[PDB]
Amino acid sequence: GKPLEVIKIEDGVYLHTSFKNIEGYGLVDSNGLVVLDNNQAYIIDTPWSEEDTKLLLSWATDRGYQVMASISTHSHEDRTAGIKLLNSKSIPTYTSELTKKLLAREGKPVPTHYFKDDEFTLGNGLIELYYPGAGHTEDNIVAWLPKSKILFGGCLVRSHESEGLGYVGDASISSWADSIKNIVSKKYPIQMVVPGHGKVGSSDILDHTIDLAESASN
Amino acid sequence: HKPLEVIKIEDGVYLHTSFKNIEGYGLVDSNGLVVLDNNQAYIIDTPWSEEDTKLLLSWATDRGYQVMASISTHSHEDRTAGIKLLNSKSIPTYTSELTKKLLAREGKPVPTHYFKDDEFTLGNGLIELYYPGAGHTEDNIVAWLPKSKILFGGCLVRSHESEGLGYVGDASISSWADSIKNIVSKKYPIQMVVPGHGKVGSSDILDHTIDLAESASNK
Numbered sequence A: 001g002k003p004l005e006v007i008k009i010e011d012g013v014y015l016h017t018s019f020k021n022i023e024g025y026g027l028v029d030s031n032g033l034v035v036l037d038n039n040q041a042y043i044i045d046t047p048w049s050e051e052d053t054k055l056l057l058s059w060a061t062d063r064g065y066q067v068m069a070s071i072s073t074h075s076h077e078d079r080t081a082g083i084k085l086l087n088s089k090s091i092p093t094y095t096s097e098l099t100k101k102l103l104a105r106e107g108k109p110v111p112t113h114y115f116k117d118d119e120f121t122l123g124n125g126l127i128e129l130y131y132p133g134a135g136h137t138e139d140n141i142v143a144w145l146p147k148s149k150i151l152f153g154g155c156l157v158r159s160h161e162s163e164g165l166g167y168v169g170d171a172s173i174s175s176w177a178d179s180i181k182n183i184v185s186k187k188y189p190i191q192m193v194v195p196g197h198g199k200v201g202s203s204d205i206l207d208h209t210i211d212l213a214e215s216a217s218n
Numbered sequence B: 001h002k003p004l005e006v007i008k009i010e011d012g013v014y015l016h017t018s019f020k021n022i023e024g025y026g027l028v029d030s031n032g033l034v035v036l037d038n039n040q041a042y043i044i045d046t047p048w049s050e051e052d053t054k055l056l057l058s059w060a061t062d063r064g065y066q067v068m069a070s071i072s073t074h075s076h077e078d079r080t081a082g083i084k085l086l087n088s089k090s091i092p093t094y095t096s097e098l099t100k101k102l103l104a105r106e107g108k109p110v111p112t113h114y115f116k117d118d119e120f121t122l123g124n125g126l127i128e129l130y131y132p133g134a135g136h137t138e139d140n141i142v143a144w145l146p147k148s149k150i151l152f153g154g155c156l157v158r159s160h161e162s163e164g165l166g167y168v169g170d171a172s173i174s175s176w177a178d179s180i181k182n183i184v185s186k187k188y189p190i191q192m193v194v195p196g197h198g199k200v201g202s203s204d205i206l207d208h209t210i211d212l213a214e215s216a217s218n219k
């Protein structure tokens, strides 16, 4: 069969990490966040398994948190599992309108809620969502947390120690550098960047990511 | 999803390579072989999925080949997901006894044939199968092709480019080096070693794999 892990990375911000076995390669890890506003919880990108999502919801309800919503950063396979489960529990699920329509076109579970512009904030200013343009996928969005000064980049960003753009099957490689530069133009006072895969780091992760992007489109 | 590739690597020996998309990491490859004996084809490890297995069968039958048998090197899927499909088409499927019983214990489709000893041959001498000991898994076997002088090591061996042992969830790391030394003790005149993942190489792959095993075992 290794199980979901949750760890505190700031006050009211927890990193959750799930694991899959890759035959021939080893273990690949995947991150998202739980963000607390008092005792209300928000999930950014659920575990890829419906199983590990189940465990994440229990992680929260066992601490007396009320899970208010989930946000999914894009439409890929691993982001669907949680949507279906949280829909079933009447927990509000959010994506961009575009991500929602992509999911519906692919016959996948759709979120119950969705925002239409390129910016949207959740909680009472707790989570600022932003669509910076195509990169990892055509629809990928990021989440900015103004209080903790953390950017959740998901797979649109690559961690420091990692050396490629990851799964690029649905990527817009020649658009990617420009999309990271759009995040940069927000002039968020970024203190930490959480990638979809790998270790958390500083704002450097964005520069690192443009390097990989600019290299590959050559 | 990138589809099955098949390429000739020796007279009568073809490398088949199947791909999976790994979110966060990229594309991973998995290798097996097809070995021909005139019109008769033998598959060493099926492809990773049923769909790619289907493509492998069509690759062979579009060429007029008769698929006589498959052999799977252990009870993990990148070796066995094709057993159900071949079973449906009444194509004999083989594993060791231990691999067969592991599959059955896990409620997985089992091969229609198996062998009991540490050695077995298929295709009347074409393919020599050997169980060297635990490593990648408790049950992993290798395949020696005396004509083409190819060793198929599967995930018991690691390509040069690989700097780790791969998926070690079911591994016996402290036994792994000995198990490779057991292969080496066979004195096969090895010209090429085909790993389960990554590029084909020479007998040096075996030394590389020993290095990796010994390093991980020290911890």
Ligand SMILES: [Zn+2]
Binding pocket: A074, A076, A136, A137, A155, B023
């Ligand atoms: Zn993705």
Ligand SMILES: [Zn+2]
Binding pocket: A023, B074, B076, B136, B137, B155
């Ligand atoms: Zn295996």
